[PDB]
Design a protein around this ligand. Structure first.
Ligand SMILES: Nc1ncnc2c1ncn2[C@@H]1O[C@H](COP(=O)(O)OP(=O)(O)O)[C@@H](O)[C@H]1O
Ligand SMILES: Nc1ncnc2c1ncn2[C@@H]1O[C@H](COP(=O)(O)OP(=O)(O)O)[C@@H](O)[C@H]1O
Ligand SMILES: [Mg+2]
Ligand SMILES: [Mg+2]
Ligand SMILES: [Zn+2]
Ligand SMILES: [Zn+2]
Ligand SMILES: [Zn+2]
Ligand SMILES: [Zn+2]
Ligand SMILES: [Zn+2]
Lengths: 590, 398, 50, 133
């Protein structure tokens, strides 16, 4: 077909056959791409391959156009010519191809396999028309890494609360964080149909699962889980529209005598209605969805479309809408497959509603007046492009938090990403700061809360309490074994267990560790419930016990203590072997 | 309250209800489930404790055979069952459901109300006639009485159940034939609706009432519409012995399949009923997905002969009894016309044709004399017509 | 879809002739009438039977 | 006659054995079983008379509700010729996923879509059979 070059928007009909997505290139850009790197395959409306009866020649620079077909030196007719000549490669629109110099970072974006962190460092600084193609090829290479993977299957029906898994032997069984969905399949007479899309979580003893569910179909013997294979599918819209300002509230007219339980948010809603797009940074425990309900009810008469990238967030906003929002004028959007345990109590699946709850995973191409995006650090630039293409609104709000879970980016293993390089909107929330925030913490005592607000924040959080004073930091020597792919520190837990008789308070103690093997063996020698750091961001507790195994990069990142230790409301027994985690939060010494 | 709950169970459907429970509480009954999951299996008589029952009373305060089951379970099961019922609402062979949430203590429990069901189900009748016990049979007497098959004084008889001291029990059982045939037809309609609506599920005998309506969608997986399949392996198979005990297909020997119309005026010379057998199979056992050969000569093996013969032994009870027996054919030997049997029309094996017929023979050897003297074609053709009233068995000739 | 599903489910193989699909499922009928006698013979009054 | 009935093979055989009983050549009601091009003509000649006793609404294409992409089509999977008898398509795809240009061309060319979608017609201007408008 014919369209625009990816980096100069000139008319062209060339596809570089060696790329992942094979994008459009003009003659100048395709030529420059096929001299520099190893990419030596180009596709016009007909492929640039040697059209001999039998031959294998694909490099255009030694391919020759003879008559009607393409040939190499071995079998070309005496008539010229080489396609790759005169500083160009043959193709449509030779008169309108404008040259450029962005071939360097284009090659860096194309030939990379996205393993090291510098690829994501380099994928966000570029001109953003190239950033869409970078996001598309990153999602595509993630997909092809996913396609070379093995399936799961359930053993039997074991229990309602927990299941057990059976796996075909030979290829690795995964990490089970909630971010890795597995699609079920009824292999019945003789058809294969989708029923449920489960994730799993690390077991108690041997092979076990604490799961999260999709459909009330009870899973029988003939059910095996494939991870997922939803294709990356082309994107057009930019990740962000330009920031333009309006003199008044355009397209939105207020109400009268709304409410007073969020009375410190009206001018915030006005500033939302002034400009094009707004950002609110939400620290843990602020009521971001409550702010969403308030802004929706300020203009109770226009399109407010709620979109959350993840389905925990849409469940949260659904129960929030039950708590506050009027019921009948709301619509949750169910996908074609009913991807999770869908909350169906409203006017579900109505494209002609006002308050629309949906996921980017199954957005329809509808209109909007102001759109509400949720959980930004989850959202990748591909999803931002999708939500901009499918949903169009006069005003935008983006709520999320950089310090929380970012997007997973399972291909990245070496080099921790900095919070602005999570996505574009996170970069906007750091570089120029957030357009708003809700500065209030309602779970943390004064000392812990101003230590987290001193480490990264601008002291934005306070305490609606005084210090509880069972938040302890210990000097644990931590003899390690790590006779597993993870790290194990049992005698350190033995020291902690040699305590806890001087503390009658926290006997419901919640074990929290960033290391998985210690998490699994935690409820083994001692009968205290155990949860990893992946159980955070939505749950709050009163008594948390922390056992740190190693002092390394995984145990040095501060966001991740921020998401782990904020769960404790009135008490945390934080035991570490690190000498640097120490003056950051000034606990007692003992 | 115990009265507000009943008034809600009423709904738009104007009826009066008499509580079989006690103060909006679950009534415990002792039914005959067909259940298969990973911990219990088989066709056994269980005890269900999840259904409050209310009996509808018509004019004259007479309690009739029409109940209101208001089974209550969790919220997401209510959700899925509403969705599946909405997909399957238009089918006439579906019990009219009613979905509502009600207040019990301070909390909302969802109740699904099935309307106008019989007291017993298909599985109850199948279990009563399949696990019979002459000392303890109260779910069979009640079924026989409530549908006017007997008079409730038939059970005072010396032997009301024995087939050799009381052949009239066959006539008594035959009164359920038109109640089972309509149930089969409604099963076909429900299967067609599931197939068109794209719903995958397993049809059990305990999910269809004695009228024929289906009312349970607990494990009905929905898929792309038009690609769903019903699993009727365990439905038609247990019900299979009942289809001839109660003579459920005796209405197919009447024109327009109406019990008031006279008999089909069958042709005497007709012996090949392959098309009629196929039509009956596709009308009743439509979604039985195994291959059915009316003539058993085409069967795959000895496990296909039994299956097609099992279907034929019922499909041959709607055809005239004079169309069976050997198939004779006028052959000529030595210029003289024989009449010999060149085949058979089995009731079970269908039509079987001889592979070696010699229409124009010259010399008859001892083997040929033996064959042509053994077969009854010669004697029955030569003999006089007989009408023996001493026996009910068919008489051919004397 | 309703009457079409009815007549297809009534079929044995699932195959029906095409000429009877409108004959049994079409909800609207048009009669083209060349002269008055045929009008008096086929659709006289406000209701008729075809 | 039944409206849904399209297979008149038994009736054709009964007519042949009642009238042309001692015509000793083989007669196939469905011409798909014929021996060669001299057997197609013979059986077609018998059928062109044997098809004048059957209703004219039982001929025409044989449609069948197939499902594509989860949506129900109604397409012609055969024909009931007056001369060649009943002919069934060897390639019917009851559950299709993607429709290529060949499939769009076939499913748009056949009258099953249009006649099924169209309104019923009764044209008194002509004696020819009218299907739909
Ligand atoms: N209008 C309001 N007035 C007082 N407190 C509020 C208001 N809105 C939200 N909150 C507080 O914010 C918290 C909301 O937490 P949660 O419901 O988990 O949502 P989020 O995770 O977005 O903060 C509650 O503890 C509540 O006390
Ligand atoms: N332990 C249980 N208690 C109550 N209901 C259950 C239980 N387990 C399953 N069910 C639900 O009950 C249904 C079977 O109910 P059943 O006893 O057959 O009554 P009905 O025929 O009215 O559904 C299943 O589809 C399932 O959804
Ligand atoms: Mg919120
Ligand atoms: Mg049931
Ligand atoms: Zn390339
Ligand atoms: Zn270019
Ligand atoms: Zn070559
Ligand atoms: Zn067989
Ligand atoms: Zn022929």
């Amino acid at each position: 077909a014919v369209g625009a070059c990816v980096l100069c928007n000139s008319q062209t009909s060339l596809r570089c056959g060696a790329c992942i997505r094979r994008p459009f290139l003009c003659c100048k850009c395709c030529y420059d791409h096929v001299i520099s790197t190893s990419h030596k395959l180009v596709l016009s409306v007909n492929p640039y391959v040697c059209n001999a009866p039998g031959c294998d020649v694909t490099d255009v620079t030694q391919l020759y156009l003879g008559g009607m077909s393409y040939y190499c030196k071995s079998h070309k007719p005496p008539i010229s010519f080489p396609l790759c000549a005169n500083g160009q490669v043959f193709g449509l629109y030779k008169n309108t191809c404008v040259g450029s110099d962005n071939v360097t970072d284009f090659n860096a974006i194309a030939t990379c396999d996205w393993t090291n962190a510098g690829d994501y460092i380099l994928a966000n600084t570029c001109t953003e028309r190239l950033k869409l193609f970078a996001a598309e090829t990153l999602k595509a290479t993630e997909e092809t890494f996913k396609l070379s993977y093995g399936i799961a299957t359930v053993r039997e029906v074991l229990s309602d609360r927990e299941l057990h898994l059976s796996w075909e032997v030979g290829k690795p069984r995964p990490p089970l964080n909630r971010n890795y969905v597995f699609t079920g399949y009824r292999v019945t007479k003789n058809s294969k149909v989708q029923i449920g899309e489960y994730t799993f979580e690390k077991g108690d003893y041997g092979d076990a699962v604490v799961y999260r569910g999709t459909t009330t179909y009870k899973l029988n013997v003939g059910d095996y889980f494939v991870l997922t294979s939803h294709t990356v599918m082309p994107l057009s819209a930019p990740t962000l529209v330009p920031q333009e300002h309006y003199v008044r509230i355009t397209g939105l007219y207020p109400t009268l005598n709304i409410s007073d339980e969020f009375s410190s948010n009206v001018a915030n809603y006005q500033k939302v209605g002034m400009q094009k797009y707004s950002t609110l940074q939400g620290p843990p425990g602020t009521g971001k969805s409550h702010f969403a309900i308030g802004l929706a009810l300020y203009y109770p008469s226009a399109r407010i479309v709620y979109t959350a990238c993840s389905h925990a967030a849409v469940d949260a906003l659904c129960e929030k809408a039950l708590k506050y929002l009027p019921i009948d004028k709301c619509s949750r959007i169910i996908p074609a497959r009913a991807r999770v345990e869908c909350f169906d109590k409203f006017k579900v699946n109505s494209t002609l509603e006002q308050y629309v709850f949906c996921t980017v995973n199954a957005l329809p191409e509808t209109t909007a007046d102001i759109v509400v995006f949720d959980e930004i650090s989850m959202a990748t630039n591909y999803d931002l492009s999708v939500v901009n293409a499918r949903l169009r609104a006069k005003h935008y709000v983006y709520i999320g938090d950089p310090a929380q879970l970012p997007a997973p980016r399972t291909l990245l293993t070496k080099g921790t990403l900095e919070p602005e390089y999570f996505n574009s909107v996170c970069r906007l929330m750091k570089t120029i700061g957030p357009d708003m925030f809700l500065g209030t913490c309602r779970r943390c005592p004064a000392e812990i809360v101003d230590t987290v607000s001193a480490l990264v924040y601008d002291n934005k959080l306070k305490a609606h309490k005084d210090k509880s004073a069972q938040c302890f930091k210990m000097f644990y020597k931590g003899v390690i074994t790590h006779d597993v792919s993870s790290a194990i520190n049992r005698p350190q837990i033995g020291v902690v267990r040699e305590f806890l008789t001087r503390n009658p308070a926290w006997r419901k103690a919640v074990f929290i560790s960033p290391y998985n093997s210690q998490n699994a063996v935690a409820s083994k020698i001692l009968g205290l419930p155990t949860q990893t750091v992946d159980s955070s961001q939505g749950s709050e507790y009163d008594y948390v016990i922390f056992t740190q195994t190693t002092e390394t990069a995984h145990s040095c990142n501060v966001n991740r203590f921020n998401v782990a230790i904020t769960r404790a409301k009135v008490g945390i027994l934080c035991i570490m072997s690190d000498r640097d985690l120490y003056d950051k939060l000034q606990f007692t010494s003992l | 309250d115990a009265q507000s709950f009943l008034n809600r169970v009423c709904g738009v459907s104007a009826a009066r209800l008499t509580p079989c429970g006690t103060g909006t509480s679950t009534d415990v009954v002792y039914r005959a489930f067909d259940i298969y999951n990973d911990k219990v299996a088989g066709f056994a008589k269980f005890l269900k404790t999840n259904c409050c029952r209310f009996q509808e009373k018509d004019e004259d305060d007479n309690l009739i055979d029409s109940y209101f089951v208001v089974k209550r379970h969790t919220f997401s099961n209510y959700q899925h069952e509403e969705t599946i019922y909405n997909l399957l609402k238009d089918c006439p062979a579906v019990a009219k459901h009613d979905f509502f949430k009600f207040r019990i203590d301070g909390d909302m429990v969802p109740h699904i109300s099935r309307q106008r069901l019989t007291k017993y189900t298909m599985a109850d009748l199948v279990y009563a006639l399949r696990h019979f016990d002459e000392g303890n049979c109260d779910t069979l007497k009640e079924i026989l009485v409530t549908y006017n098959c007997c008079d409730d004084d038939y059970f005072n008889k010396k032997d009301w159940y024995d087939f050799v001291e009381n052949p009239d029990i066959l006539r008594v059982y035959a009164n359920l034939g038109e109640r089972v045939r309509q149930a089969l037809l409604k099963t076909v309609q429900f299967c067609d609706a599931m197939r068109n609506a794209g719903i995958v599920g397993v049809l059990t005998l305990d999910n269809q009432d004695l009228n024929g309506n289906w009312y349970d969608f607990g494990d009905f997986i929905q898929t792309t519409p038009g690609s769903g399949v019903p699993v009727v392996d365990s439905y038609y198979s247990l019900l299979m012995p009942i289809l001839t005990l109660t003579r459920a297909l005796t209405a197919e020997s009447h024109v327009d399949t109406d019990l008031t119309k006279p008999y089909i005026k069958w042709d005497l010379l007709k012996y090949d009923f392959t098309e009629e057998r196929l039509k009956l199979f596709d009308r009743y056992f439509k979604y039985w997905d195994q291959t059915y050969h009316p003539n058993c000569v085409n069967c795959l093996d000895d496990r296909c002969i039994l299956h097609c013969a099992n279907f034929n032994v019922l499909f041959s009870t709607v055809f005239p009894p004079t169309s069976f027996g050997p198939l004779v054919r006028k052959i000529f030997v030595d210029g003289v016309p024989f009449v010999v049997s060149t085949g058979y029309h089995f009731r079970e094996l269908g039509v079987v044709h001889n592979q070696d017929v010699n229409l124009h023979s010259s010399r008859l050897s001892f083997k040929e004399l033996l064959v042509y003297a053994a077969d009854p074609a010669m004697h029955a053709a030569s003999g006089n017509l007989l009408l023996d009233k001493r026996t009910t068995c068919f008489s051919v000739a004397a | 879809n309703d009457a079409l599903n009815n007549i297809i489910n009534n079929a044995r193989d699932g195959c029906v002739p095409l000429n009877i699909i409108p004959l049994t499922t079409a909800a609207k009928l048009m009669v083209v009438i060349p002269d008055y006698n045929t009008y008096k013979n086929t659709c006289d009054g406000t209701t008729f039977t075809y």
